[PDB]
Amino acid sequence: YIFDLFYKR
Amino acid sequence: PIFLNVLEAIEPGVVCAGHDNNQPDSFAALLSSLNELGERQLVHVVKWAKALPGFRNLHVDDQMAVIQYSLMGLMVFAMGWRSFTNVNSAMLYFAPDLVFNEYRMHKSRMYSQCVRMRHLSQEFGWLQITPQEFLCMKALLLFSIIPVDGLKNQKFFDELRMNYIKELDRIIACSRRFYQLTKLLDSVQPIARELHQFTFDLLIKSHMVSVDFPEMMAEIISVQVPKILSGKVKPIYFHT
Ligand SMILES: C[C@](O)(CS(=O)(=O)c1ccc(F)cc1)C(=O)Nc1ccc(C#N)c(C(F)(F)F)c1
Numbered sequence: 001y002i003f004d005l006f007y008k009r
Numbered sequence: 010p011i012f013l014n015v016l017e018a019i020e021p022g023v024v025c026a027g028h029d030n031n032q033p034d035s036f037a038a039l040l041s042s043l044n045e046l047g048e049r050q051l052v053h054v055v056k057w058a059k060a061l062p063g064f065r066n067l068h069v070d071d072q073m074a075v076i077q078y079s080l081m082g083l084m085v086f087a088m089g090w091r092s093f094t095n096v097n098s099a100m101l102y103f104a105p106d107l108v109f110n111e112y113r114m115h116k117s118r119m120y121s122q123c124v125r126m127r128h129l130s131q132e133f134g135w136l137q138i139t140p141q142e143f144l145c146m147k148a149l150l151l152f153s154i155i156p157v158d159g160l161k162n163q164k165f166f167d168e169l170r171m172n173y174i175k176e177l178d179r180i181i182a183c184s185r186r187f188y189q190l191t192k193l194l195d196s197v198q199p200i201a202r203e204l205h206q207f208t209f210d211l212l213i214k215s216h217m218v219s220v221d222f223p224e225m226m227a228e229i230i231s232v233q234v235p236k237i238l239s240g241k242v243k244p245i246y247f248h249t
Contacts, residue, residue: 001232002225007055007073 012062012176016144019060021053021087026107034116040211041221043117046104048223050084051076058151063169068161075166077233078154078242081201081208086150086194089126090143093133101127119207125200132193145180146194149173153194154244156236170245191247198244202237209234 026046032038058064058076067075092102101109101123114123133143152170160166181187211220212230222230236242 002228003077004073006225007076008069 013141013144013180015060015062016141016148019057020144021057024049024053024104026104028104028106030106034113036116036118037219037221039113039117042107043103044220044222044226046107047080047084047226051080051225054080054083061148061151063172064151066165066169068165071160071162071166074160074233075151075155077229078237079151080229081204082150082153082197082244083147085126085129085200085204086147086197089130090133090138090147092127092130093138098127098130098134101130119204122200122203122207125203129193129196129200132196136189136193138190138193139180141180142177142190145173145177146190149177150194150197152245153198154237154242156242157240195246195248198246201244205234205237209238 024046026042026049028042029038054076058072064072088101088103092098092100095102096108101114103109109117109123114120114127117123132138138146149170152166152173155163155166177190178187181190209230211218212222212227215222233242
């Protein structure tokens, strides 16, 4: 999910 | 006043919608701007929630879950206070470059919802809501909606939530205030849900009405919002 990759960076 | 210091310390600043206010007020322009603002505000909500006391105890998937569910309600609640302070509830202060007057409300096609939100914005006044009560109500809003069959570590969640209520208790220090503030927080949820419905529908018909959704928001709308709408995820209500 694009929110997942953004959320954890 | 260690808890209250933190809330104010981590409070987001001004976020603009990037709106073109030379454009005549088309439905599509307005909503393509509301969506961009959505994403901008989301980003700021992620940053905020992380620097939130105890938030990091939550399993990571609960953090992400919990933010996606609450997003609307947070946006709504803060928007109502912004609108109250900035323009005394005359109009909807979504952002500085994006203030809704009656005509815009009609133009967005969310007039009923807006009137609801305008009304809540007045309530910050009708109740003399201190800025300290608001900040803490807004934190508690992030712990105010969950999938029915629970989160991964539901117990670490329930602790955090019951601890944010202890903090509000202290911000109220009197039994009668709690009645009203808890009633006020419940008002947000119906509105969040009407917004959620509208938003979801819009995504479906969006290619036919020329409205523009940032990748990340379209995914969230297609993946998380349906759970809310299908009753898998449900707000925690104080009352009824
Ligand atoms: C139409 C929409 O863009 C949908 S969205 O922002 O993409 C969105 C998508 C999924 C969500 F769970 C929440 C929000 C939206 O409701 N935007 C929006 C933007 C800013 C503010 C503010 N303030 C608000 C509202 F909270 F006032 F409704 C709403």
